[PDB]
Amino acid sequence: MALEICVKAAVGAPNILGDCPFCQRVLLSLEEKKIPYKSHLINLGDKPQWFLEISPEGKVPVVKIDDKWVADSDVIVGILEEKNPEPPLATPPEFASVGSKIFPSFVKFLKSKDPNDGTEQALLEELKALDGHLKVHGPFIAGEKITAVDLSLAPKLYHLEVALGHFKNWPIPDNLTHVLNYIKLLFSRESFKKTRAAEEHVIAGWEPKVNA
């Protein structure tokens, strides 16, 4: 019945959830569905036998779905939907195949301190396609509402918008009017605002590995 999470901690601050992608996918999905809920963080290397039984690295997010546990970026979502008693919508169609261009793209580019400028605009080209899908369909990326498509991509786009926004400043241009407008919703939907990671612990938490 009640379901929730054993996740990476914000590094150096074990109260807010961590800078991992799949961590916020499933947290967002459950708070958007507004279910009763269970578990809490794995506190940064504090790994008793309970978490070593649950999480495969001892430091990887999982879902605790009615006391069964799974952990890979899609598996964590799809089985969570299947075993949720509230009606799920586990549908990744064309909107997700466009999303599969964008997801590794913006992660690589925020991580990249290349001469990335023409290639930053190659992410803009893939976002221009995404801009096209909402301006034809109306609502959120999956065409009618937040489904598994939006729930997969939006959590790591929050990590984009805090990290790239502070380290290597590139705001979303307003010519990509969809992408800017709906990211504004993602920053403050009641579910997303509650499940957001700490800004400082993505910025000074994910990039020091990228630096040194």
mmCIF file of N, CA and C in Angstrom, residues 47-120:
data_model
loop_
_atom_site.group_PDB
_atom_site.id
_atom_site.type_symbol
_atom_site.label_atom_id
_atom_site.label_comp_id
_atom_site.label_asym_id
_atom_site.label_seq_id
_atom_site.Cartn_x
_atom_site.Cartn_y
_atom_site.Cartn_z
ATOM 1 N N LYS A 47 25.947 2.290 5.612
ATOM 2 C CA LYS A 47 25.316 1.149 4.936
ATOM 3 C C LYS A 47 25.205 -0.103 5.837
ATOM 4 N N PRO A 48 24.149 -0.169 6.667
ATOM 5 C CA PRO A 48 23.953 -1.382 7.468
ATOM 6 C C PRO A 48 23.502 -2.538 6.579
ATOM 7 N N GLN A 49 23.424 -3.741 7.131
ATOM 8 C CA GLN A 49 22.987 -4.913 6.371
ATOM 9 C C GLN A 49 21.612 -4.711 5.727
ATOM 10 N N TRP A 50 20.711 -3.981 6.368
ATOM 11 C CA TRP A 50 19.413 -3.649 5.774
ATOM 12 C C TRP A 50 19.567 -2.975 4.410
ATOM 13 N N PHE A 51 20.350 -1.911 4.310
ATOM 14 C CA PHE A 51 20.523 -1.274 3.006
ATOM 15 C C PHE A 51 21.398 -2.086 2.071
ATOM 16 N N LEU A 52 22.341 -2.867 2.573
ATOM 17 C CA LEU A 52 23.136 -3.714 1.681
ATOM 18 C C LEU A 52 22.306 -4.847 1.085
ATOM 19 N N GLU A 53 21.250 -5.258 1.766
ATOM 20 C CA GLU A 53 20.296 -6.206 1.196
ATOM 21 C C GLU A 53 19.430 -5.495 0.156
ATOM 22 N N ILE A 54 19.003 -4.275 0.444
ATOM 23 C CA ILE A 54 18.115 -3.514 -0.441
ATOM 24 C C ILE A 54 18.782 -2.946 -1.709
ATOM 25 N N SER A 55 19.862 -2.182 -1.583
ATOM 26 C CA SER A 55 20.460 -1.417 -2.692
ATOM 27 C C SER A 55 21.690 -2.118 -3.272
ATOM 28 N N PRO A 56 21.832 -2.179 -4.613
ATOM 29 C CA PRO A 56 22.897 -3.060 -5.115
ATOM 30 C C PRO A 56 24.326 -2.560 -4.938
ATOM 31 N N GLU A 57 24.515 -1.247 -4.834
ATOM 32 C CA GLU A 57 25.843 -0.664 -4.600
ATOM 33 C C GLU A 57 25.942 -0.202 -3.148
ATOM 34 N N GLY A 58 24.847 -0.283 -2.395
ATOM 35 C CA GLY A 58 24.800 0.279 -1.045
ATOM 36 C C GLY A 58 24.637 1.794 -1.029
ATOM 37 N N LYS A 59 24.674 2.365 -2.229
ATOM 38 C CA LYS A 59 24.628 3.814 -2.469
ATOM 39 C C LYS A 59 23.942 4.145 -3.799
ATOM 40 N N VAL A 60 22.906 3.383 -4.129
ATOM 41 C CA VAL A 60 22.103 3.599 -5.350
ATOM 42 C C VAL A 60 20.625 3.699 -4.956
ATOM 43 N N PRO A 61 19.875 4.668 -5.523
ATOM 44 C CA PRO A 61 18.439 4.719 -5.224
ATOM 45 C C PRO A 61 17.682 3.458 -5.582
ATOM 46 N N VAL A 62 16.631 3.173 -4.832
ATOM 47 C CA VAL A 62 15.750 2.039 -5.112
ATOM 48 C C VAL A 62 14.324 2.546 -4.942
ATOM 49 N N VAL A 63 13.330 1.767 -5.340
ATOM 50 C CA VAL A 63 11.984 1.922 -4.781
ATOM 51 C C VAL A 63 11.777 0.786 -3.797
ATOM 52 N N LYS A 64 11.112 1.058 -2.679
ATOM 53 C CA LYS A 64 10.636 0.006 -1.779
ATOM 54 C C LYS A 64 9.147 -0.095 -2.056
ATOM 55 N N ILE A 65 8.839 -1.014 -2.953
ATOM 56 C CA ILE A 65 7.481 -1.258 -3.416
ATOM 57 C C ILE A 65 6.896 -2.426 -2.643
ATOM 58 N N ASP A 66 6.140 -2.104 -1.598
ATOM 59 C CA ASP A 66 5.448 -3.105 -0.775
ATOM 60 C C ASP A 66 6.409 -4.197 -0.259
ATOM 61 N N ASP A 67 7.612 -3.739 0.069
ATOM 62 C CA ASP A 67 8.737 -4.540 0.577
ATOM 63 C C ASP A 67 9.355 -5.526 -0.423
ATOM 64 N N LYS A 68 9.484 -5.032 -1.648
ATOM 65 C CA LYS A 68 10.264 -5.632 -2.729
ATOM 66 C C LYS A 68 11.077 -4.451 -3.230
ATOM 67 N N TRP A 69 12.252 -4.649 -3.813
ATOM 68 C CA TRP A 69 13.101 -3.508 -4.187
ATOM 69 C C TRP A 69 13.807 -3.641 -5.539
ATOM 70 N N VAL A 70 13.649 -2.657 -6.422
ATOM 71 C CA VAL A 70 14.299 -2.659 -7.747
ATOM 72 C C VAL A 70 15.001 -1.323 -8.055
ATOM 73 N N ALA A 71 16.083 -1.370 -8.841
ATOM 74 C CA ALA A 71 16.995 -0.232 -9.039
ATOM 75 C C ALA A 71 17.814 -0.155 -10.353
ATOM 76 N N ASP A 72 17.218 0.332 -11.434
ATOM 77 C CA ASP A 72 17.919 0.698 -12.676
ATOM 78 C C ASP A 72 17.023 1.799 -13.224
ATOM 79 N N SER A 73 17.527 2.749 -14.001
ATOM 80 C CA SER A 73 16.796 3.987 -14.296
ATOM 81 C C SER A 73 15.393 3.887 -14.894
ATOM 82 N N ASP A 74 15.121 2.842 -15.659
ATOM 83 C CA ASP A 74 13.779 2.592 -16.182
ATOM 84 C C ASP A 74 13.006 1.594 -15.329
ATOM 85 N N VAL A 75 13.707 0.610 -14.788
ATOM 86 C CA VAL A 75 13.090 -0.473 -14.010
ATOM 87 C C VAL A 75 12.474 0.074 -12.725
ATOM 88 N N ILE A 76 13.164 1.045 -12.140
ATOM 89 C CA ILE A 76 12.729 1.714 -10.915
ATOM 90 C C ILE A 76 11.367 2.389 -11.151
ATOM 91 N N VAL A 77 11.092 2.817 -12.383
ATOM 92 C CA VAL A 77 9.837 3.489 -12.747
ATOM 93 C C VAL A 77 8.757 2.489 -13.158
ATOM 94 N N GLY A 78 9.094 1.569 -14.052
ATOM 95 C CA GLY A 78 8.076 0.742 -14.679
ATOM 96 C C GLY A 78 7.436 -0.258 -13.744
ATOM 97 N N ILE A 79 8.205 -0.782 -12.805
ATOM 98 C CA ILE A 79 7.648 -1.731 -11.846
ATOM 99 C C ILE A 79 6.932 -0.940 -10.749
ATOM 100 N N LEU A 80 7.401 0.271 -10.465
ATOM 101 C CA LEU A 80 6.709 1.140 -9.511
ATOM 102 C C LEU A 80 5.309 1.449 -10.016
ATOM 103 N N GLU A 81 5.171 1.765 -11.296
ATOM 104 C CA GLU A 81 3.842 1.988 -11.873
ATOM 105 C C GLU A 81 3.009 0.708 -11.798
ATOM 106 N N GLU A 82 3.583 -0.429 -12.174
ATOM 107 C CA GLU A 82 2.802 -1.665 -12.255
ATOM 108 C C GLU A 82 2.246 -2.091 -10.894
ATOM 109 N N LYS A 83 3.026 -1.885 -9.844
ATOM 110 C CA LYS A 83 2.644 -2.307 -8.493
ATOM 111 C C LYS A 83 2.033 -1.190 -7.644
ATOM 112 N N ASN A 84 1.776 -0.034 -8.238
ATOM 113 C CA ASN A 84 1.064 1.036 -7.544
ATOM 114 C C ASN A 84 -0.442 0.737 -7.623
ATOM 115 N N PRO A 85 -1.178 0.760 -6.494
ATOM 116 C CA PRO A 85 -2.625 0.510 -6.578
ATOM 117 C C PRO A 85 -3.475 1.655 -7.156
ATOM 118 N N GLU A 86 -2.948 2.868 -7.214
ATOM 119 C CA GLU A 86 -3.624 3.996 -7.862
ATOM 120 C C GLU A 86 -3.375 3.849 -9.366
ATOM 121 N N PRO A 87 -4.303 4.288 -10.238
ATOM 122 C CA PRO A 87 -4.082 4.016 -11.667
ATOM 123 C C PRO A 87 -2.812 4.595 -12.310
ATOM 124 N N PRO A 88 -1.902 3.727 -12.792
ATOM 125 C CA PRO A 88 -0.706 4.252 -13.460
ATOM 126 C C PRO A 88 -0.890 4.604 -14.936
ATOM 127 N N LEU A 89 0.113 5.261 -15.504
ATOM 128 C CA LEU A 89 0.138 5.538 -16.938
ATOM 129 C C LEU A 89 1.559 5.389 -17.474
ATOM 130 N N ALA A 90 2.003 4.140 -17.500
ATOM 131 C CA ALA A 90 3.366 3.770 -17.887
ATOM 132 C C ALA A 90 3.546 3.707 -19.408
ATOM 133 N N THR A 91 3.417 4.845 -20.072
ATOM 134 C CA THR A 91 3.440 4.917 -21.535
ATOM 135 C C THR A 91 4.578 5.806 -22.062
ATOM 136 N N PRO A 92 5.705 5.226 -22.523
ATOM 137 C CA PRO A 92 6.715 5.908 -23.352
ATOM 138 C C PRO A 92 6.662 5.690 -24.903
ATOM 139 N N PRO A 93 5.857 6.488 -25.649
ATOM 140 C CA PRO A 93 5.698 6.475 -27.117
ATOM 141 C C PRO A 93 6.718 7.395 -27.808
ATOM 142 N N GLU A 94 6.432 7.921 -28.998
ATOM 143 C CA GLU A 94 7.273 8.922 -29.687
ATOM 144 C C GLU A 94 7.779 10.079 -28.818
ATOM 145 N N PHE A 95 6.987 10.529 -27.859
ATOM 146 C CA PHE A 95 7.420 11.622 -26.993
ATOM 147 C C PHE A 95 8.661 11.257 -26.166
ATOM 148 N N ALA A 96 8.791 9.976 -25.848
ATOM 149 C CA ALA A 96 9.968 9.452 -25.166
ATOM 150 C C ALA A 96 11.126 9.195 -26.134
ATOM 151 N N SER A 97 10.857 8.895 -27.398
ATOM 152 C CA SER A 97 11.954 8.695 -28.347
ATOM 153 C C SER A 97 12.606 10.043 -28.670
ATOM 154 N N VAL A 98 11.844 11.128 -28.674
ATOM 155 C CA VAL A 98 12.430 12.478 -28.726
ATOM 156 C C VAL A 98 13.183 12.764 -27.424
ATOM 157 N N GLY A 99 12.608 12.351 -26.302
ATOM 158 C CA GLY A 99 13.259 12.495 -25.006
ATOM 159 C C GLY A 99 14.594 11.775 -24.893
ATOM 160 N N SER A 100 14.753 10.664 -25.602
ATOM 161 C CA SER A 100 16.017 9.918 -25.634
ATOM 162 C C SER A 100 17.125 10.589 -26.439
ATOM 163 N N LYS A 101 16.812 11.645 -27.176
ATOM 164 C CA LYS A 101 17.851 12.484 -27.775
ATOM 165 C C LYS A 101 18.351 13.432 -26.695
ATOM 166 N N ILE A 102 17.390 14.019 -26.006
ATOM 167 C CA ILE A 102 17.613 15.153 -25.118
ATOM 168 C C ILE A 102 18.262 14.731 -23.811
ATOM 169 N N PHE A 103 17.820 13.622 -23.232
ATOM 170 C CA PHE A 103 18.328 13.198 -21.929
ATOM 171 C C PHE A 103 19.850 13.006 -21.873
ATOM 172 N N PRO A 104 20.459 12.207 -22.776
ATOM 173 C CA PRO A 104 21.919 12.184 -22.617
ATOM 174 C C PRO A 104 22.608 13.462 -23.095
ATOM 175 N N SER A 105 21.929 14.249 -23.923
ATOM 176 C CA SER A 105 22.491 15.463 -24.505
ATOM 177 C C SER A 105 22.748 16.527 -23.453
ATOM 178 N N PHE A 106 21.737 16.929 -22.693
ATOM 179 C CA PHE A 106 21.961 18.041 -21.768
ATOM 180 C C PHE A 106 22.814 17.624 -20.580
ATOM 181 N N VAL A 107 22.824 16.338 -20.261
ATOM 182 C CA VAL A 107 23.672 15.847 -19.180
ATOM 183 C C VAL A 107 25.115 15.982 -19.632
ATOM 184 N N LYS A 108 25.399 15.539 -20.852
ATOM 185 C CA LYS A 108 26.758 15.609 -21.379
ATOM 186 C C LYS A 108 27.190 17.053 -21.493
ATOM 187 N N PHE A 109 26.330 17.915 -22.002
ATOM 188 C CA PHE A 109 26.730 19.298 -22.206
ATOM 189 C C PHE A 109 26.937 20.131 -20.949
ATOM 190 N N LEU A 110 26.162 19.916 -19.896
ATOM 191 C CA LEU A 110 26.437 20.608 -18.638
ATOM 192 C C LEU A 110 27.749 20.102 -18.029
ATOM 193 N N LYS A 111 28.028 18.815 -18.217
ATOM 194 C CA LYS A 111 29.256 18.170 -17.736
ATOM 195 C C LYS A 111 30.479 18.610 -18.540
ATOM 196 N N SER A 112 30.243 19.032 -19.771
ATOM 197 C CA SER A 112 31.290 19.359 -20.736
ATOM 198 C C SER A 112 31.781 20.805 -20.661
ATOM 199 N N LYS A 113 33.091 20.958 -20.546
ATOM 200 C CA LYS A 113 33.743 22.271 -20.541
ATOM 201 C C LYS A 113 34.639 22.311 -21.771
ATOM 202 N N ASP A 114 34.098 21.742 -22.837
ATOM 203 C CA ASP A 114 34.658 21.697 -24.202
ATOM 204 C C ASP A 114 34.718 23.124 -24.786
ATOM 205 N N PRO A 115 35.112 23.305 -26.068
ATOM 206 C CA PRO A 115 34.514 24.408 -26.850
ATOM 207 C C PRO A 115 33.028 24.202 -27.223
ATOM 208 N N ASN A 116 32.220 23.691 -26.299
ATOM 209 C CA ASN A 116 30.799 23.445 -26.547
ATOM 210 C C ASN A 116 29.987 24.734 -26.627
ATOM 211 N N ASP A 117 29.613 25.074 -27.849
ATOM 212 C CA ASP A 117 28.780 26.240 -28.143
ATOM 213 C C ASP A 117 27.914 25.898 -29.347
ATOM 214 N N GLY A 118 28.552 25.473 -30.429
ATOM 215 C CA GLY A 118 27.821 24.909 -31.552
ATOM 216 C C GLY A 118 27.119 23.619 -31.170
ATOM 217 N N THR A 119 27.740 22.815 -30.321
ATOM 218 C CA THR A 119 27.111 21.603 -29.794
ATOM 219 C C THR A 119 26.105 21.910 -28.681
ATOM 220 N N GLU A 120 26.224 23.057 -28.029
ATOM 221 C CA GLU A 120 25.211 23.459 -27.045
ATOM 222 C C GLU A 120 23.938 23.787 -27.822
#
